Each structure stands twice: as C-alpha cells, then as structure tokens.
Design a protein around this ligand. Structure first.
Ligand SMILES: CN(CCCCC(=O)NO)CC(=O)Nc1ccccc1
Ligand SMILES: [K+]
Ligand SMILES: [K+]
Ligand code: NA
Ligand SMILES: [Zn+2]
Length: 636
C-alpha cells in the first residue's frame, strides 16, 4: 500500500505580482508561497515530503474546464505591456494579470495534476500543492478573484477522465465561495462539492444569490452541491467542527468518495484580513484528520487563498503535519456553535434532507491580531506498542513494536495486595503490560498509543483507568463495546464513558453516552451516524488527555474508522484493551492505531429506531455538551 506525502512547489509561481495600485488585489502577493514553503522547511516538514516536480498543464488539459476563447485571450497576456494588462484585467472582477501569470497559471494547474497522478498511482498516500494563482473562483470563460484557471476543477475532471472515477469529494474550506467549482459540477452527481464561506446575507464578495444554502445542484446533480454560508464574522473552532460533524462528514462518509480534493484556503484562519474569522491554525490539523479515513486516505490538498503571512505559515504546517500522520494538537475551549452558525447549519441540513440519509429524519414528523503560536507536533519514535497473548508472534507495520521493569512489577504487587485475592499470574502480566504501555505513552513522545490483549476486563479496566488518572491525565474518555457495567465512575468531571451495547439501558447522567443499536444489516450506517453526530462532538468538547478503548469478547467493520477518528483527541494517545484473542480485530486495531490507511466502507440508510434513539441522546446531552447542537436553541 502507498506511503509518504507529496509536496509540490516551485519558486517560479512566485514570479508574478500586481503592477498597479489596486487595494482590492494588493493582498495577493508572491510572499504567500515563499512564507508557506519556508515555514514548512523551518519545521522540518518539507524534508519529510516527496518533492514532486511542477509541470505545465497542456492545452488539452486546460480545455477540460475552460473555453477555447478564454484560453486564447489569456494566451495573449505574456505579450502585453502594463497598460494592456490593466485594460485586460478590468474585464474581470477582482483579478490582475502580469506578463508571467499565464505561465504560472499553467504551472499551478500542472502542479495539481502532478499531485493527482502521484496519489492515484499510489506513489504517495496523499499530498499538498502550494500554487499561485489560486483557482476556485475561475470559470469556463472568466478570470475571477485572483484566479485564472480552476486548479481543483481540473484535478477532478482529470481524475474522472484518466482514472475512471465515479465519486470525487471536493472540500472548499477557503473563506470565499468557490463559485467556479460550483458552476463546473452543478449538474454532475459524480463530484460532490462542499463549501463554507463568509456570506453575510449576500453582502460579502462575490455577492451571489447562488452561494446560499439553497443551491443544492441542478438536475441529476441535485444534492451534490452543499453551500454553508457564514452570516457573521468571528467564526470559531466550534463553528468549524459543528459544520464538519453535522453537515460535511455525514454526507462525505455516505457519499464514499474515491478521491478527496481540498480547496485549502487559509483565509478562514484567525488574523486573516479577508475572512475575519477566529479559528486557530490548529483546527486545520483536525479538518485534515477527519477527512483522511475517506477514499483510503487519498487526499490532494491544493492551496487557494490565505493572506496573513503568519497564520498562513502556521496553518499550512498544521495541514502537512496531519498528512504526514503526526499527532493532532488538543483543541481546548470547544462548545456550542454560535446562533448564526447554528441557523446556517440547520438551514442547509433541512434543504439537503431530501437527498441525504443522515438528514432524512428531519423531513417527516416521526423525526494587529495576536494568538498563541502553535506547539510543536512530534511523531513518536515508535508509534504503536502491541502486547498480544504470550507467544503469539505477528507481523507488525514498521512503526509498531512489542511490549516489564522492576519499578513496574513492584507496582502490580502493591496494587494486587490492596485491591485484588487475585493470583492468576497471567492477569498479573497483563496489568504489568498496561502500566508499562501507559508509562511509555504519557511519560514521553517515544510511544503514542498501544493495544493490549487481556483476559479479565474488570481488573484490567480498573488498573488502566486508575493508573492513567494519576499519571496525571486530567480527563479520560472511555469507549466501551460490550454490555454490563465497568469499574468506571463518572461522578466527577474526569471521565466520560461512551458505551456501545446490545441492551437498552437507561442513561441517567450527562457524563455517559449509551448507544443501544438494533442488531442487523443496518448496524454499520447507524454506528457511523452515531460516531460523527454524537461521539465525536462530545469527545471533542470533553478534550480528554487519554482515550481508553475496551472491547469485550462477546460484528464491527467500523472499528478502524473509530480508532482513526478518535485519534483526533488526546494527541492520539489511545490505549485499547481487547478481551480475548481475535487475530483480525487485533490486526485491524494495530493498523489503525499506527496510522495506516483505512479501508472504505462502501454502501446507505439506518433504522428509524436507531435514528430516534440517537436524537433522544442528542436531546438529553446537548444542553451540557453544546457541540452536539445542530439547530438553534429555543429561547424561553
Ligand atoms: C479579496 N477580493 C476577492 C477575494 C478572492 C480572494 C480569495 O481568497 N478567494 O478564495 C474581494 C475584495 O473586494 N477585497 C477588498 C476590496 C477593497 C479593499 C479591501 C479588500
Ligand atoms: K469555501
Ligand atoms: K456537484
Ligand atoms: Na477591477
Ligand atoms: Zn479565499
């Protein structure tokens, strides 16, 4: 399977710039590229990427998305002097031309196609192209908003033609609406376009009625265009994550794309003079991470906008970190989206309810700026430690490793004499393994997570949790697949328990989420719905310092997706206890913990009984855990 991350960049794309006075355009500078690449080099990230050369897009490739008339007109601009270039730029809205911009536009487009080929040929797992000019505003026959050719539309049209793909997801998290992309795939159900964007009730550029939530696509493409307008500035991490948990991800995982292309504009980050949003650069680590389980990780990130040279460098690094599989930074202070965002979210969910399973239950009655600089992100020496039963020798990925010191063994004796009387010398071993793994996970950046196979749940769970709480881990999220009660107390604020069980048990307080899922062929859709719409919002707001997974011995081809997505919490520090040996479940768990590619789910819809149970959970929990909200609260 594929390894590595491509970084596609060329200094030539910084060799065009604005040549006359224009306050509309003067923010789009060559230094955006140089500052972004230099930030990647300073933090050692560029050196870990496969450098893939830029190339020119050919004429035939440009004609995939643009008209011969527009290409011919642009092809004349290298021969133009300044007067002529200004007169040519004035034919379009918010865009400037330069003797070298046609050359650079073919390089920006060619670089994107290079990234698509490297990913689709399995030469790398994923990658990023740092390109100028940006593309998502350009149209069949027009330059627009600093864009000459539509780099990302190219990429999806090219991937359709040369790899025969049927489903491509485009995620445009730039702060501006990519109307060029929307127009290009308006009638095409093979390409799902999602865009969030500053809108302010159509008063923000480009001021288009069709940038509103009601544009769902046309014809056979209805439902495959999703616009989420931001009608106030100052949107926060909570707003962005609410958008992902309650709009984008439910749709994306049901769509099941074969390739993901990101229109990655970082003018949606704090400090940007165009976006005026308040999301931290660290949010882009999670926006990347939450999409990586799609399409077996095949993700092409393509630079669009981003104008504060400082938030720009930091957000680029946070994205590349996540592409390389580095641990995600903890996001603190999360809660409800603001009222304006919740209104946008609820409106798009309602209009989209005719088209998407996750929303379908809504249709019927049944129903000078400063911020803290980001902390260093370090890949662990060994990422995953594994402790299979005694004498079970398995083949581990190159970043995994097998499992007891004198200190540790003394601790198990101390613990045994006080609380357990237990003498099963192999349980005593597993308790020594839990403590040894937890110590490596929490003490240093040497190990990031681990899996231990165990026999007795009660003593194992109690030692794992109680030893984590005194590391100290101020907060521990427990995720338990099985029935019965655990030795886990959620009375203080230090533990949240997610339990996936078979018998409907009354959940009584708000530090527990109990999911009784009706057994059947519907189970995979229901679990994914619960994961994106309930489990992830609560976990992210809780912000644990450790995740503890627990599976009792008494099917779940969802485990790999959960293990991957749940590593967005606690800097990826997850300990999984598997009760009993299962070769396949242990291989799957270790593979996902180690950062390997997740195999797609393919195909659908879940039981109304399960949707009703999940929404009852949301109603029961969203007053305490506001990130669960996907409607505006009713005021007294
Ligand atoms: C920035 N332009 C076009 C946006 C495309 C950039 C992007 O990132 N697209 O993805 C709008 C504008 O009119 N700005 C403006 C005008 C006068 C004084 C100050 C600012
Ligand atoms: K956008
Ligand atoms: K579409
Ligand atoms: Na103009
Ligand atoms: Zn933008």
């Amino acid at each position: 399977a594929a390894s590595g991350s491509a970084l596609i960049f060329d200094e030539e794309m910084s060799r065009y710039k604005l040549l006359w006075t224009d306050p509309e355009c003067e923010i789009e500078v060559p230094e955006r590229l140089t500052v972004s690449y230099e930030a990647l080099r300073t933090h050692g990230l560029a050196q870990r990427c496969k450098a893939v050369p830029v190339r020119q897009a050919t004429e035939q490739e440009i004609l995939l998305a643009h008209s011969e008339e527009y290409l011919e007109a642009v092809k004349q601009t290298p021969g133009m002097n300044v007067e002529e270039l200004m007169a040519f730029s004035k034919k379009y809205n918010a865009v400037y031309f330069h003797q070298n911009i046609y050359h650079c536009a073919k390089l920006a487009a060619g670089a994107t196609l290079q990234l698509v080929d490297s990913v689709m040929k399995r030469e790398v797992r994923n990658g990023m192209a740092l390109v100028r000019p940006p593309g998502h505003h350009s149209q069949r026959s027009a330059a627009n908003g600093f864009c000459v050719f539509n780099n990302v539309a190219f990429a999806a049209l090219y991937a359709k033609k040369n790899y025969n793909l049927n489903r491509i997801l485009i995620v445009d998290w730039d702060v501006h609406h990519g109307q060029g992309i929307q127009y290009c795939f308006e009638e095409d159900p093979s390409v799902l376009y999602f865009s969030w964007h500053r809108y302010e009730h159509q008063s923000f550029w480009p001021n288009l009625p069709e940038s509103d939530y009601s544009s769902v696509g046309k014809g056979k493409g209805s439902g495959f265009n999703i616009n989420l307008p931001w009608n106030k500035v100052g949107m926060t991490n909570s707003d962005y994550l609410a958008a992902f948990f309650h709009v984008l991800l439910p749709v994306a995982y049901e769509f099941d794309p074969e390739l993901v292309i990101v229109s990655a504009g970082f003018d949606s980050a704090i400090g940007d003079p165009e976006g005026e949003m308040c999301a931290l650069p660290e949010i882009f680590a999670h926006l990347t991470h939450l999409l990586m389980p799609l399409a077996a990780g095949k993700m092409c990130v393509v630079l669009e906008g981003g104008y504060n040279l400082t938030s720009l460098g930091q957000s680029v690094c946070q994205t590349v970190h996540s592409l390389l599989g580095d641990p995600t930074p903890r996001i603190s202070g999360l809660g409800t989206a603001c009222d304006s965002a919740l209104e946008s979210i609820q409106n798009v969910r309602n209009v989209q309810s005719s088209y998407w399973s996750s929303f379908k239950h809504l249709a019927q009655s049944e129903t000078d700026i400063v911020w803290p600089e980001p902390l260093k992100r370090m890949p662990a020496s060994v990422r995953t430690v594994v402790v299979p039963p005694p004498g079970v020798e398995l083949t581990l990925p190159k970043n995994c490793q097998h499992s007891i010191s004198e200190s540790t063994a003394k601790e198990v004796q101390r613990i045994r004499d006080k609380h357990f009387d237990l003498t099963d010398q192999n349980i005593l071993r597993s308790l020594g393994n839990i403590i040894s793994v937890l110590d490596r996970m929490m003490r240093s950046d040497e190990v990031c997570n681990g899996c231990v196979v165990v026999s007795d749940l009660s003593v194992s769970v109690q030692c794992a949790l109680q030893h984590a709480l005194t590391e100290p881990a101020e907060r521990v999220l427990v995720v338990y697949v099985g029935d019965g009660e655990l030795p886990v107390k959620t009375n203080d604020g230090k533990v949240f328990l997610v339990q996936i069980c078979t018998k409907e048990t009354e959940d009584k307080c708000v530090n527990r989420l109990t999911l009784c899922l009706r057994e059947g062929e519907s189970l995979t859709a229901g679990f994914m719905q619960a994961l994106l719409g309930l489990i992830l919002p609560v976990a992210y707001e809780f912000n644990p310092a450790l995740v503890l997974g627990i599976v009792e011995e008494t099917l779940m081809r969802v485990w790999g997706h959960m293990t991957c997505l749940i590593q967005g919490l606690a800097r990826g520090r997850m300990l999984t206890l598997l009760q009993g040996y299962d070769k396949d479940l242990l291989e799957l768990t270790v593979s996902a913990l180690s950062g390997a590619s997740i195999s797609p789910l393919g195909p659908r819809a879940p039981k109304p009984e399960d949707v009703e149970m999940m929404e009852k959970q949301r109603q029961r929990l969203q007053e305490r855990w506001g990130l669960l909200r996907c409607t505006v609260s009713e005021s007294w």
